[PDB]
């Protein structure tokens, strides 16, 4: 129920950083190149315990479904194969992505009408800010 308020479809209306987001995890030139230009909608929906969040773009089509706390496989936008987590933490999901010794940490927030995603690898930090579509 409080997971309510993520639930809808938003779309991409700002980014910052994300480059050198990529660049740090490690995203090579051709695909920050193309995924820099997208404008993903983010579907986010609930039934029962499990979550589904849902990229589409005309770069990559991405989904996937979990429960909070239980780890689960995901391909991500950009080709890693990761083991990831996501929690709910004081009202932020956190999702953990692991994958060869490395670890990065996205967070999704409501803030105002938008929903604000952090993403964090090492000392880089990208925002990117959705609008309900
Ligand atoms: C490539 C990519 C990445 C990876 C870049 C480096 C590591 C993660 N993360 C995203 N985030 C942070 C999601 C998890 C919120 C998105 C993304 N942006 N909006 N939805 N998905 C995209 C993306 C998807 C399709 C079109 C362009 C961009």
New binding site residues.
């Given amino acids: 129920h409080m997971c309510d308020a993520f639930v809808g479809t938003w779309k991409?209306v700002s980014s910052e950083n994300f480059d050198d987001?990529?660049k740090e995890?490690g995203?090579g030139f051709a695909?920050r190149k193309v995924?820099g230009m997208?404008k993903?909608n983010?579907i986010i929906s609930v039934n029962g315990d499990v979550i589904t969040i849902k990229?589409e773009?005309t770069?990559?089509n991405?989904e996937i479904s979990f429960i909070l706390g239980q780890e689960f496989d995901e391909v991500?936008?950009?080709d890693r194969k990761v083991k990831s987590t996501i929690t709910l933490d004081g009202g932020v999901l956190v999702?953990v992505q692991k994958w060869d010794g490395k670890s990065?940490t996205?967070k999704?927030k409501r803030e105002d009408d938008k929903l604000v995603?952090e993403?964090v690898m090492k000392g880089v930090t990208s925002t990117?800010v959705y609008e309900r579509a």
């Fill in positions: 991409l987001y990529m995890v995203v695909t995924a997208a993903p983010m990229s773009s770069f990559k991405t991500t936008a950009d999702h990065t996205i999704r995603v993403c990117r």
